Design a protein around this ligand. Structure first.
Ligand SMILES: *[C@H](NC(=C)C(=O)O)c1c(COP(=O)(O)O)cnc(C)c1O
Length: 342
């Protein structure tokens, strides 16, 4: 171990011992005449305000031994959340960090990345092309060549991503509500979270249904990429970590139901979840309607609504999509679903 590498490892292990337990909010909603409990795993209640704080620590740990000195620049592609966490860890460690982003990124998340002193490399792909991710990966490789010291953790293929969720995220959930949860709903982009959770649950709770939630136009599990307004959830490439056989079901959600879920849940309970979380809640509403015997499920909520305050919760961003922020109208997009505290 070099000097820089020993320290990084130690910082990462301190962050992990000091990482809080992520809470669960218990919510009830009647679906097709049958009451259901949603266990919302609120991963935005966390130091870097998303689940990707765990991902980021997993990844930094894996790239530490590659660090000779403090010359190293950390480069990574992100839709947002991983940026914030890697950005913060690198600020805390004194290591420079370049975040490769595109124009679709949530402004709130982009601002939290800049505030951590990262360098933003914006990619100029026009919003409503389908090559954003490939263009980001493209630009990352240009930067790894053009910058000495440069180190790419590769969230997309680095097994540390799935591994952290298998060994940390999934046991915590299991320990909290494993005896109760008949299903777990998980949004996909890289697929590392679900691949990790699935690896844990298929061993420890085989009877628990694992359900991927994705959005229209995402090709995590195959298909033809299409344009999307939501971020975090969805990718224009197949997952390295996960195939369709590794989970029990897969539901795609229209983005307007995801948006509707965000607003209605907030109105009904005061829990404001992030965009992918709304898609997960919408997806669980659909899935439970088709499964009368499923009455308790975890929704893994990747982040919270404060990250989307100038998109998903902004009346002006919604107007070009023909949507209000009126909970009553948006409830019609969820078949009248009503949430309450359990
Ligand atoms: C993670 N997405 C990112 C690509 C990132 O750069 O942070 C993500 C996900 C999907 O999680 P995976 O483990 O499948 O990548 C879902 N929801 C949000 C908000 C998010 O940041």
């Amino acid at each position: 171990l070099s000097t820089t590498a020993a320290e990084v490892l130690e910082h990462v292990d301190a962050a992990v011992a000091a990482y809080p337990e992520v809470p669960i909010a218990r919510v009830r909603v009647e679906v097709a005449g049958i009451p259901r409990t949603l266990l919302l795993k609120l991963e935005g209640r966390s130091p870097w305000r998303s689940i990707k704080g765990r991902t980021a620590l997993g990844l930094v740990r894996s790239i530490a031994p590659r660090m000779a000195s403090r010359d190293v620049t950390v480069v990574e592609s992100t839709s947002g959340n991983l940026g914030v966490a890697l950005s913060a860890i690198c600020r805390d460690l004194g290591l420079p960090f370049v975040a490769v982003v595109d124009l679709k990124q949530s402004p709130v998340i982009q601002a939290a990345i800049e505030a951590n002193g990262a360098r933003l490399e914006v990619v100029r792909t026009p919003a409503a092309a389908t090559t954003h991710l490939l263009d980001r990966l493209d630009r990352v490789r240009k930067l790894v060549a053009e910058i000495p010291g440069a180190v790419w953790p590769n969230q997309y293929e680095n097994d540390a991503n799935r591994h952290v969720h298998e060994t940390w995220t999934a046991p915590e959930i299991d320990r909290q509500v494993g005896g109760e949860a008949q299903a777990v709903f998980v949004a996909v982009s890289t697929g590392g979270t679900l691949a990790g959770l699935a690896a844990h649950f298929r061993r420890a709770r085989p009877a628990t249904r694992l359900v991927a939630v994705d959005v229209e136009g995402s090709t995590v599990f195959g298909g033809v990429p299409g344009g999307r307004v939501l971020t975090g959830i969805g990718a224009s490439r197949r997952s390295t970590f996960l195939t369709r056989a590794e989970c029990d079901d897969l539901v795609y959600v229209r983005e307007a139901a995801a948006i509707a879920a965000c607003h209605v849940l907030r109105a009904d309970t005061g829990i404001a979840v992030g965009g992918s979380s709304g898609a997960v809640v919408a997806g669980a509403l659909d899935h439970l309607a088709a499964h009368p015997g499923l009455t308790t499920a975890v929704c893994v909520c990747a982040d919270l609504g404060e990250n989307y305050a100038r998109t998903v919760y902004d009346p002006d961003w919604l107007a070009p999509l023909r949507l209000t922020d009126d909970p009553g109208l948006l409830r019609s997009r969820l078949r009248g679903a009503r949430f309450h505290h359990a």
